[PDB]
Structure 1
Amino acid sequence: PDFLGHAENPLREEEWARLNETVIQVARRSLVGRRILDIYGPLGAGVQTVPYDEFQGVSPGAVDIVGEQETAMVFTDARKFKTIPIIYKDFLLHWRDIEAARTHNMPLDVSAAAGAAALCAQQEDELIFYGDARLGYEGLMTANGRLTVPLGDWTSPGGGFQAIVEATRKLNEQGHFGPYAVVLSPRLYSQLHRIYEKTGVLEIETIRQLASDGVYQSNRLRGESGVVVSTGRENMDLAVSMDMVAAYLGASRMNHPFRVLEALLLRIKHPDAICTL
């Protein structure tokens, strides 16, 4: 019979396979921060730690052949890797329904799961774009090397043109150049969605051709802020230990509790690539 219990896997192999498929689908649609930076390789949950620092840093020298003289480069400086967080949003499945699905119904419902993952992965991005004083992190607002531009995103028609252009100026001048990506607040994006501009075509065409890796909108970024980076690797890395998954709390009073587990840590290996408002 059922039985009751505590041996599951409350699902069976098929429904279990579904829940995983549903979660990563909805999570991936709600993740705006994995689309602006290409991911690191999976390290498994086996590693607790992701390497942390580079550059800062010195330019010169060559003569002919021997020495005269450098460097030894760097390392830079100290360690250790600040443990990749494990973030979770919890939800329960309620009593019998699952077992009603074992005979009566073919579709097993999702009380939360797609919603919780959507809530969790989003909050993950808030972790990415802001800083955390709580445990030892680099956000894209706290990394310094920001050389903060006198904002941009005016009302007057030039507006965001001058901004991103000014960004590229100092970014390039710091002695770091490459393909650029631009992240904006939705409110900024609409006010910057232009209207009109140069009389040839609109803002999307001019910015997307200027930054030229892409243009993206995040809801978790500060309303006033927006950030420009360089997508090139060995600059920033999005370090993922474990991806998004459905996990089991086990038997409880009576319930099946789940959590969604996501471990994402972003390291800034060259913090000359970051510019805020």
Structure 2
Amino acid sequence: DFLGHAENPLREEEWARLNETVIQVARRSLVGRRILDIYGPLGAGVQTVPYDEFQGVSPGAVDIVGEQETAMVFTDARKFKTIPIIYKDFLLHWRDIEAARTHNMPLDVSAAAGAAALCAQQEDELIFYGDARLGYEGLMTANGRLTVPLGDWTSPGGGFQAIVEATRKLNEQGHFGPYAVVLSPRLYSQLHRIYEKTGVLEIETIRQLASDGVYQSNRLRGESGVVVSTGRENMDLAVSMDMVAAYLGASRMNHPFRVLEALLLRIKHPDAICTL
């Protein structure tokens, strides 16, 4: 019982409820997975993934006899990068578990939801701004990033001008694709104005421009945003382990857990990103 260092203090139903709470909170609060493809669950043992980095676009060939060399040069010391662990710990009191077994019954997993939300915010912080001490580049910090100025979004139409300048600069690097826009909550809120006066709310015009979506991230600092050309060849998310709760063993008769995932953002084409 609670006296004793028992592994698995939770029943199977409580484990299922804990896990599905983690999944729902993560699906509610992850913006990076909306705009990025997943390379796929590699398994938790995969700790390192290839980091292929392409510097220019090499287009396809059209000819009668296909004798044109049309591959990327694939030279200069193909990099690998370590998949980090993104995690947050939460705590269950043992008397709540003992209450769940005898006295007032439903085991509250709100600390699991809070830790899942913080692990999701850490994943989005890793996707957008990277990690300096582990040497990870985010979307907002990638070296070679095609940045446009962010000019005067307090008037309606400034957002449309910024996004068409961003997509024009992305067009110049051969990234013509369906765009995604992620903005800070200030910039996203300023797009929700019907005072565009050529129509309708400005975010509808941006949503026609992007076509993969316009998003808030509260990880985006200040007035800032990013337009990406989506697709697996430009960037993806190497997820070796999707988000899961793990028991840590009892510490002070209480039960700590870790909501964790293991994923890395792979920016293959840094010129497919344009910020502000």
TM exceeding 0.5:
yes
Cα displacement (A) at 1:62? 6.2
Cα displacement (A) at 1:104? 2.3
- Structure 1 partner of 2:202: 203
Secondary structure (helix, strand or coil) at the match of 1:34 reads helix
**Is the CA contact (8 Å cut-off) linking 2:194 and 2:200 kept in structure 1?**
no
Structure 1 pair 6/167, CA: closer, same or farther in 2 (3 Å)? same
Structure 1 pair 156/255, CA: closer, same or farther in 2 (3 Å)? closer
1:170-212 Cα deviation digits (max 9, x unpaired): 1101122111110111111112322321432221221111111
Whole-Å Cα distance in 2 between the matches of residues 61 and 92 of structure 1?
Answer: 55
Larger mean CA deviation between 10-19 and 55-64 belongs to 55-64
Cα displacement (A) at 1:130? 0.8
Whole-Å Cα distance in 2 between the matches of residues 113 and 185 of structure 1?
Answer: 26
**Is the CA contact (8 Å cut-off) linking 2:99 and 2:105 kept in structure 1?**
no
Cα displacement (A) at 1:274? 0.7
**Is the CA contact (8 Å cut-off) linking 2:191 and 2:201 kept in structure 1?**
no
Structure 1 pair 197/65, CA: closer, same or farther in 2 (3 Å)? closer
Structure 1 pair 141/13, CA: closer, same or farther in 2 (3 Å)? same
**Is the CA contact (8 Å cut-off) linking 2:248 and 2:256 kept in structure 1?**
yes
Cα displacement (A) at 1:56? 2.1
Secondary structure (helix, strand or coil) at the match of 1:136 reads coil
**Is the CA contact (8 Å cut-off) linking 2:58 and 2:72 kept in structure 1?**
no
Whole-Å Cα distance in 2 between the matches of residues 256 and 155 of structure 1?
Answer: 49
Cα displacement (A) at 1:63? 9.2
**Is the CA contact (8 Å cut-off) linking 1:159 and 1:192 kept in structure 2?**
no
* 1:220 partnered with 2:219: yes
- Structure 2 partner of 1:45: 44
List alignment gaps of at least 5 residues for structure 2: none
Structure 1 pair 17/204, CA: closer, same or farther in 2 (3 Å)? same
Larger mean CA deviation between 207-216 and 62-71 belongs to 62-71
1:41-95 Cα deviation digits (max 9, x unpaired): 1011021112101322463796967897646633243244211111211122112
CA-atom RMSD, angstroms? 2.2
Structure 1 pair 153/213, CA: closer, same or farther in 2 (3 Å)? farther
Larger mean CA deviation between 54-63 and 253-262 belongs to 54-63
Cα displacement (A) at 1:169? 0.9
Structure 1 pair 189/153, CA: closer, same or farther in 2 (3 Å)? farther
Whole-Å Cα distance in 2 between the matches of residues 230 and 239 of structure 1?
Answer: 18
Structure 1 pair 179/253, CA: closer, same or farther in 2 (3 Å)? same
User: How many pairs align?
Assistant: 276
Whole-Å Cα distance in 2 between the matches of residues 214 and 234 of structure 1?
Answer: 18
**Is the CA contact (8 Å cut-off) linking 1:90 and 1:116 kept in structure 2?**
yes
Secondary structure (helix, strand or coil) at the match of 1:247 reads strand
Larger mean CA deviation between 252-261 and 2-11 belongs to 2-11
Larger mean CA deviation between 229-238 and 153-162 belongs to 153-162
Secondary structure (helix, strand or coil) at the match of 1:87 reads strand
